[PDB]
A paper describes a structure:
The [name]-[name]-2 [name] ([name]), a cysteine protease with essential functions in viral replication, has been validated as an effective drug target. [name] is a cysteine protease that contains a catalytic dyad consisting of the nucleophilic cysteine 145 (C145) and histidine 41 (H41). It proteolytically processes the viral polyproteins pp1a and pp1ab at no less than 11 cleavage sites, and thereby also ensures its own release. In this work, we demonstrate that the [name]-[name]-2 [name] is subject to redox regulation in vitro and contains multiple redox switches including a disulfide-dithiol switch between the catalytic residue C145 and C117, as well as a SONOS switch of residues C22, C44 and K61.
Specifically, an allosteric SONOS bridge consisting of two cysteines (C22, C44) and one lysine (K61) within one protein chain was detected by our mining of the protein data base and independent structural studies of Liu and coworkers. SONOS variants, in particular those containing an exchange of residue K61, are very susceptible to aggregation under oxidizing conditions and exhibit an atypical early onset of thermal denaturation (30–35 °C) with almost no cooperativity of unfolding, indicating a very loosely structured protein. Under reducing conditions, the protein is structurally stable. This would imply a structurally stabilizing function of the SONOS bridge under oxidizing conditions. The X-ray crystallographic analysis of the [name] variant in complex with the acyl intermediate formed between C145 and Q306 of a symmetry-related [name] molecule indeed reveals marked structural changes throughout the whole molecule with an r.m.s.d. of the Cα-carbons of 2.87 Å for chain A and 3.10 Å for chain B, respectively, compared to the wild-type structure. The structural changes for [name] are clearly more pronounced than observed for variants C44S (0.89/0.91 Å) and Y54F (0.24 Å), highlighting the structural importance of K61. Overall, the redox switch mechanism protects [name] against oxidative damage by forming a C145-C117 disulfide as a stable storage of the catalytic cysteine avoiding an irreversible overoxidation or formation of other kinetically stable modifications. The SONOS bridge structurally stabilizes the monomer that is formed upon oxidation by covalently tethering three structural elements within a monomer.
Author numbering:
A (entry chain A), B (entry chain C): 1 to 306
């Protein structure tokens, strides 16, 4: 059995990553059909980064100012348009490795695998999720722009993330493939801090069910609690308010293990007021909120007795 | 910034995964050139994992019994050989997606990425480590046999693991691509179990070294201690004794850092009693030992792989 933080096979995405260069700046781009997507701050320099006028920079730019590299073969740019905060570079040849894809703007709390890239080549793949403050706790260095996040459903690659910047607190912020940012962020050089990062309550509960399958059944309580008793009382270290939509998707995990959704919420009420003197849970020490209820069933193909 | 447990881009490996079927059992196989590698226990139906004669079943079974299937086209096997504990099938045509591969055997302590596959189709990829007891705490389900572990240098894929079975204790055991098991395990399912597991000391120091490279500073101090006395507490606790070569491997981690290898020993001997009076230690308030120093520099630099 076992349970680990897995990521989707990044193979289908590697075939779409290319290198985009504009002047002295070099970052990654997503090659889909005959269009190359990348963050729009590639056409900017250091002097004009205080308050860039992308409309002015885009028009005054040229097609040959962009140097798109697909591995070692250079791609010819025939047109350039801007959609919000992502740049669309139209090329002459379509990407033969284009997989069936879609653009999905995920909500804060959902997970997705990221493919970190540098100079158009993939470096690594990891799983993560958007924090409540519309940020991600990924790992990026200089030249990581263009690193996309994605999920794979059946066989279609649902892109959702497009890395742009890194907050001074260490976290990262990005957009979707349509160019809309995630959170109160804008791509310009100004005093821009992150926000209050709480905790994904629903993910924590799901992570508990994942542990119950692989042994670890010593954190079950027999005193369910209501809604306000889990919010106005169980919010000492900031936890996202659980809604009646979370218990809907937690059904399969509840009918599988046998622990009611409301009953599992009482388990956290005991751990959030005490903790452990050294007793580990599944694998980690602090509650992991990086596993959605869909990730658990995805990796714990258990049967739900009825 | 940021430090995640990344896995290698599995693209070059996904193109080598096929579905091997013999009789009624179907497990995964690695298609490299015109040879398909898969566990030897594919020729053994679910009624022979006790003491079956393999060289007798191999010469008895012909080529029509096997059924190798790629993405959508079925292959044709010609020669079937058994090397140690891997069933080699010499197919008709060679895999056009064959990368510059390489069969290497890793000793307990090194890390590698695992590509989980079912029915010849990848499903997930994660990063793990070879435990001191010659096992891995991976995530596998029924039908995952044949899934391989690999490392990438740049253009070369270093295969090092092939899943064969799961032990009753939850961990998983397998072989290299030469067919030799990791540890005193056998393919015939008996009452075999893994030994006592220990924590990799060199990997914890390499991980604690990245914490400083990132910016986390609160558990640091300076109480020098040479290579003599630290082994006392390392063996009394549940840790692998820090050998002499482990110090030389941490060399490059001290060049672009300046901290002495013997300096971090004072910070580790104190975080094993008082608990976590601070909690935040690069995320996850516990000792992580699945970061080999060779992979800590690659994530703190930007080493890409094609």
């Amino acid at each position: 059995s076992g349970f680990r933080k897995m990521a989707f096979p990044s193979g289908k995405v590697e075939g779409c990553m290319v290198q985009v260069t504009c002047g002295t700046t070099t970052l990654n781009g997503l090659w889909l059909d005959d269009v190359v997507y990348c963050p729009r701050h590639v056409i900017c320099t250091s002097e004009d980064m205080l308050n860039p006028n992308y409309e002015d920079l885009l028009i005054r730019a040229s097609n040959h100012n962009f140097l798109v590299q697909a591995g070692n073969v250079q791609l010819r740019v025939i047109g350039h348009s801007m959609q919000n905060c992502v740049l669309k570079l139209k090329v002459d040849t379509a990407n033969p490795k284009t997989p069936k894809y879609k653009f999905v703007r995920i909500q804060p709390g959902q997970t997705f695998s990221v493919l970190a890239c540098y100079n158009g080549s993939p470096s690594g793949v990891y799983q993560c999720a958007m924090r409540p403050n519309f940020t991600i706790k990924g790992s990026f260095l200089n030249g990581s722009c263009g690193s996309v996040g994605f999920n794979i459903d059946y066989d279609c690659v649902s892109f959702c993330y497009m890395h742009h910047m890194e907050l001074p607190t260490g976290v990262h912020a990005g957009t979707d493939l349509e160019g809309n940012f995630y959170g109160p962020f804008v791509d310009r050089q100004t005093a821009q801090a992150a926000g209050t990062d709480t905790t994904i309550t629903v993910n924590v509960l799901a992570w508990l069910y994942a542990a119950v399958i692989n042994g670890d059944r010593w954190f079950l309580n027999r005193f369910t609690t209501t809604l306000n008793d889990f919010n106005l009382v169980a919010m000492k270290y900031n936890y996202e308010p659980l809604t009646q939509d979370h218990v809907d998707i937690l059904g399969p995990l509840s009918a599988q293990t046998g622990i009611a959704v409301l009953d599992m919420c009482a388990s956290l009420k005991e751990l959030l007021q005490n903790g452990m003197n050294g007793r580990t849970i599944l694998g980690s020490a602090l509650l992991e909120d990086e596993f959605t209820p869909f990730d658990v069933v995805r990796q714990c193909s258990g049967v739900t007795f009825q």
